Write an enzyme that holds these catalytic residues in place. Structure first.
Site, PDB file in Angstrom:
ATOM      1  N   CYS A  96       0.703  -0.778  -0.187  1.00 25.64           N
ATOM      2  CA  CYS A  96      -0.220   0.138   0.065  1.00 25.64           C
ATOM      3  C   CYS A  96       0.666   1.576  -0.142  1.00 25.64           C
ATOM      4  O   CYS A  96       1.993   1.323   0.432  1.00 25.64           O
ATOM      5  CB  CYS A  96      -1.118  -0.474   1.020  1.00 25.64           C
ATOM      6  N   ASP A  99       3.008   1.532   2.847  1.00 22.79           N
ATOM      7  CA  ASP A  99       3.885   1.339   3.186  1.00 22.79           C
ATOM      8  C   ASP A  99       5.221   1.505   2.143  1.00 22.79           C
ATOM      9  O   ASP A  99       6.546   1.630   2.900  1.00 22.79           O
ATOM     10  CB  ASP A  99       4.062   0.176   2.446  1.00 22.79           C
ATOM     11  N   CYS A 159      -4.106  -2.399   3.824  1.00 27.00           N
ATOM     12  CA  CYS A 159      -3.790  -2.073   2.415  1.00 27.00           C
ATOM     13  C   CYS A 159      -4.422  -1.547   1.286  1.00 27.00           C
ATOM     14  O   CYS A 159      -4.364  -0.499   0.394  1.00 27.00           O
ATOM     15  CB  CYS A 159      -2.764  -2.781   2.486  1.00 27.00           C
TER      16      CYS A 159
HETATM   17 HG   LIG Z   1      -0.204  -1.785   3.807  1.00 28.16          HG
END
Ligand SMILES: [Hg+2]
Length: 208
Positions: A96, A99, A159
């Site tokens: 995602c 991240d 995510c």
């Molecule tokens: Hg994530």
């Protein structure tokens, strides 16, 4: 712009068992080399028996494995996603948008990140270092956030709703058609990066 609830819930969902944070950082650094990571490699780095590594990962439900049973995905992944995350000459991917902002500090390397606006399809990219973001293009890039769910699989509950967008107005227009997404919020990529920093600070404090 109150972000404590997001930090708290993400920490709770990521930190399933003891040793998770101890395991995660070395795992990210290994994955960042662009090859599948064996549990024995982890065991060696950590000084753990492979049995303990297995125990930790067992709790990490969303972990991706290849046909050889080696680890290829844990936040950072070798399997293609919408979020390209390049370190040196290796193309990796991330689960995602958030991240991509968090990992460079954990890995200790600068990454070239690229994706497409989830609302318009426009290419977006930036350079993310452990301390700052640069070359944000377009400059008004935004990120969507939702509140993580503690006991749910992090990818399906978090995510998949955390994207990049070309701009805040674009993202806010997108968000108006996305009700019931608990804690759905639009922030600038800068605010999202600051969120990542606080998350990392709390996460690393839990390391041995
Ligand atoms: Hg994530």
């Amino acid at each position: 712009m109150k972000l404590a609830p997001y930090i708290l819930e993400l920490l709770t969902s990521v930190n399933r068992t003891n040793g998770t944070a101890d395991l995660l950082v070395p795992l990210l650094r290994e994955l960042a080399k662009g090859r599948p990571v064996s549990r024995t490699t982890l065991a060696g780095i950590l000084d753990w028996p492979a049995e303990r590594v297995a125990a930790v990962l067992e709790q990490a439900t969303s972990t991706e494995y290849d046909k050889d049973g080696n680890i290829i995905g844990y936040g950072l992944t070798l399997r293609e996603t919408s979020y390209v995350f390049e370190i040196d000459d290796r193309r990796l991917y991330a689960w995602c948008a958030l991240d991509t902002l968090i990992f460079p500090a954990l890995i200790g390397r600068t990454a070239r990140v690229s994706s497409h606006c989830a609302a318009t399809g426009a290419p977006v990219s930036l350079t993310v270092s452990p301390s700052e973001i640069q070359a944000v293009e377009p400059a008004g890039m935004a990120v969507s956030l939702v509140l993580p769910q503690e006991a749910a699989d992090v990818r399906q509950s978090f995510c998949c709703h955390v994207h990049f967008f070309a701009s805040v107005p674009t993202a806010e227009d997108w968000a108006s058609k996305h009700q019931g997404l608990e804690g759905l919020a639009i922030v600038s990529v800068h605010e999202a990066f600051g969120l990542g920093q606080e998350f990392n600070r709390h996460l690393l404090q839990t390391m041995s």
